[PDB]
């Protein structure tokens, strides 16, 4: 186990195949199928778990802890509780429905099981840009006092090609270890999902993000302990397929005029 | 391309930048539907920032040639970029007599043709339309087998299609 030592490569697990054998995908973009080290175990890892690999042979080394560094949120809140929720008035009608779909399921999860109502996993906020959102998410995150992840919608794309789909996965993996986690996406209307016709043939950047956004929602969150909040502008900037049941059923519009 | 054009223009000071058909790039880009913006003005912003930026000091100058002034960006005309706006209308009467004589220096004639007479037979013709008359005058002598271009070659060329003259049939009644 200690032959590997310092020169290690960061890998990612994909799917189990054979006993003590698994497929891995490193940050270099080249996927390899190697054998699992005897000191490791298939039950001690996760399908999305990141692992270590050798420099040349790229053999499996060790299972990293369920903490993904990546970028953006990294660890967690830093100096966030600078304000309270009383600084924004008139939204008490709108903020009441937000606390029920965000703060309520993160406290008592048996209220939805006994009553038998499926709490919305995703949250979209409509309305003209520059009215709501903004300080609202900060007020909810400060009153909850739990894990909070704010990832900008335009930051998912990286200069490297295959880094796009891996940065999206690392955001949801941070919500796996910490149950009271809130994932916020600022300006989700940039990449959106497929963005109507994205001309995928000429640009692959969308297909890598398109597959992950649909897979991460259905693949995770079954425990209903993690909620997703996205910040958009209007409905014409998003794919209406998101409103289909099974992924995101929630619709919130700003009370304009 | 334009950004590096002024970068190399700073190395050699006595340089002159020429732009052909300025109407190719310009617009305010409005009265449309959503996307389709900046399909033009991406390059125009280079001419805005560079000419008003560190460039255009002493010997750095840009001469922008275009077709018509009806369609362009009024923001392009400024005392910091294009100063002199000069109209170049059609040639005058006696001016066309000197133009026709210059294009004939490579031809062969008897020098018996009055050039002031051919200029008076031409009313408001383009400069290229003047040189095009000498082209047809040479083709007429080839069909008739003449060893030199005579007076009737330029006269028959006007009757043919050159400038504002088109006839597919005699049609006299």
């Amino acid at each position: 186990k200690r032959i590997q030592s310092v020169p290690l490569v960061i890998g990612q697990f994909l799917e189990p195949i054979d006993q003590n054998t698994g497929i891995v995908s490193s940050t270099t973009g080249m996927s390899y199928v190697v054998r699992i080290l005897s000191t490791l175990d298939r039950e001690l890892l996760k399908p999305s778990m990141s692992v270590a690999l050798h420099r040349h042979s790229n053999a499996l080394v060790d299972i990293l802890p369920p903490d993904s560094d990546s970028s953006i949120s990294v660890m967690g809140e830093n100096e966030k509780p600078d304000v309270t929720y009383a600084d924004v008035g008139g939204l008490d009608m709108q903020k009441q429905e937000i606390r029920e779909a965000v703060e309520l399921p993160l406290v008592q999860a048996d209220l939805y099981e006994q009553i038998g109502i499926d709490p919305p996993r995703g949250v979209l906020l409509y309305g003209p840009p520059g009215t709501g959102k903004t300080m609202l998410v900060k007020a909810v995150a400060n009153s909850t006092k739990a894990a909070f992840i704010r990832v900008n919608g335009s930051e998912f794309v990286h200069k490297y090609l295959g880094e796009g789909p891996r940065m999206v996965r690392d955001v949801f993996r941070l919500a796996r270890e910490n149950a009271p986690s809130i994932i916020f996406i600022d300006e989700v209307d940039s990449i959106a999902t497929k963005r109507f016709d994205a001309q995928t043939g000429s640009d692959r950047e969308v297909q890598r993000i398109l597959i992950e956004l649909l897979t991460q929602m259905d693949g995770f969150d079954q425990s209903t302990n993690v909620k997703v909040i996205m910040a958009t502008n209007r409905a014409d900037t998003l794919d209406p397929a998101l409103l289909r049941p099974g992924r995101l059923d929630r619709k919130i519009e700003f009370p304009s005029l | 391309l334009v950004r590096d054009a002024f970068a190399l223009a700073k190395e050699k000071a006595p340089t002159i930048i020429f732009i052909d058909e300025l109407d190719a790039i310009g617009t305010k880009r409005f009265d449309s539907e959503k996307s389709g913006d900046r399909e033009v003005q991406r390059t125009m912003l280079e001419l805005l920032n560079q000419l008003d930026g560190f460039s255009s000091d002493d010997r750095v100058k840009v001469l922008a040639a275009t077709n018509r002034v009806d369609v362009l960006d009024p923001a392009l005309l400024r005392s910091g970029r294009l100063d002199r706006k000069i109209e170049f209308p059609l040639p005058s009467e006696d001016s066309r007599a000197q133009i026709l004589q210059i294009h004939s220096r490579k031809m062969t004639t008897d020098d018996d043709i009055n050039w002031q007479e051919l200029a008076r037979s031409t009313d408001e013709f383009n400069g290229a339309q003047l040189k095009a008359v000498t082209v047809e005058a040479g083709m007429i002598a080839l069909r008739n087998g003449q060893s030199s271009v005579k007076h009737e070659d330029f006269v028959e060329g006007i009757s043919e299609v050159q400038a504002r003259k088109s006839k597919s049939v005699s049609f006299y009644a």
Partner: protein, 355 residues
């Protein structure tokens, strides 16, 4: 069978490392050569063993070794476009004698195109300039494209047929590169012929205030005019502009200096339409003693497209009308059929001269 002979010489051309060269375009020439790869990587190199110092030019693809970069063999530039390779045809079926009529639409084209190519020293005595471009529009249905192929047969050189919709690509700005693809072969291949078809979809100013998506097409001509007559008068071959709508074109494109000879097709008269049936009389089946001048006289003025339809449909009456060959009676039935019967609507001829 041919693979056995090539395996003998394949020892030096395979085992050894020669061909595995990385091709890239050279940028700066210091007489150190700065060359940028296809992966966007810049490096410095120099000449080779058999490489000549005068062969390397600015803006040329130069293959270099992948391990230790060095100049080995030069390559012709502009290797990216694959589109213009299929635009060149060979041996068109339409001959020079296929164009009927004694009128002036024949002799005027051969003197400004075929004459300087066959006898370049004829006009050199007078010291004149042969017309670079020509003008052929005419009404739809006169077989204008047939006259363009008749010139390529007598020329016996490279012919290029360009579709007006081919210049417009699926990206904005790619059409500008499509223009230089045509003029690059003019300097590479001398004494060739280029032909544009349906330029109305391209030309015209169309200004600004319209739908707003029209600014992409108007830049194709501004790229085409620049490549034709620019700051540097670079040109060799003849350029042919053709379309069915001369009125919708650019009023600058309709003025000389890019074009000198201007020929517009017209409908043949009683003497003209007679030769249309004479060139078709050698074909099909013509009964002895039939005068074709009476058939073209009963037919009104119409384009050559409807004139050739008389001889084609005349053979169709040999089945239903119970006839052996085409007789005079079947010709009179074609007058009320090929002409009078097919008028109705959707018949162009002279209908649309403008828009």
């Amino acid at each position: 069978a041919p693979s056995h002979l090539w395996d003998i010489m394949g020892d030096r051309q395979r085992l050894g490392e020669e061909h595995p060269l990385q091709v890239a375009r050279c940028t700066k020439i210091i007489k150190k050569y700065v060359i940028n790869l296809k992966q966007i990587a810049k490096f410095v190199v120099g000449l080779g063993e058999r490489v000549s110092p005068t062969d390397i030019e600015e803006g040329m693809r130069v293959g270099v070794d992948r391990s230790k970069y060095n100049i080995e063999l030069p390559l012709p530039p502009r290797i990216d476009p694959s589109v213009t390779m299929m635009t060149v045809e060979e041996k068109p079926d339409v001959t020079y004698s296929d164009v009927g009529g004694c009128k002036d639409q024949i002799e005027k084209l051969r003197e400004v195109v075929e004459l300087p190519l066959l006898s370049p020293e004829r006009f050199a005595t007078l010291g004149i300039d042969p017309p670079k471009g020509i003008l052929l529009y005419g009404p739809p249905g006169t077989g204008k494209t047939l006259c363009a192929r008749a010139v390529a047969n007598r020329t016996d050189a490279t012919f290029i047929r360009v579709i007006g919709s081919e210049l417009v690509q699926k990206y904005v700005g790619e059409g500008a590169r499509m223009v230089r693809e045509l003029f690059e072969m003019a300097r590479t291949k001398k004494a060739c012929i280029i032909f544009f078809d349906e330029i109305d979809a391209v030309g015209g100013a169309r200004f600004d205030d319209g739908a707003g998506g029209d600014n992409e097409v108007q830049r194709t001509m501004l790229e085409l005019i620049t490549q034709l007559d620019g700051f540097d008068p670079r040109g060799n071959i003849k350029v042919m502009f053709a379309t069915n709508r001369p009125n919708t074109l650019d009023p600058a494109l309709l003025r000389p200096g890019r074009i000198d000879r201007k020929v517009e097709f017209s409908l043949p008269d009683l003497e003209g339409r007679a030769n249309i049936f004479r060139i078709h009389s050698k074909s099909m089946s013509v009964e002895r003693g039939i005068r074709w001048e009476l058939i073209s006289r009963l037919c009104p003025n119409s384009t050559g497209a409807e004139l050739r339809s008389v001889c084609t449909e005349a053979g169709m009456f040999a089945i239903r009308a119970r006839r052996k060959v085409a007789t005079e009676k079947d010709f009179l039935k074609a007058v009320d059929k090929v002409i009078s019967g097919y008028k109705k609507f959707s018949s162009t001829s002279r209908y649309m001269q403008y828009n």
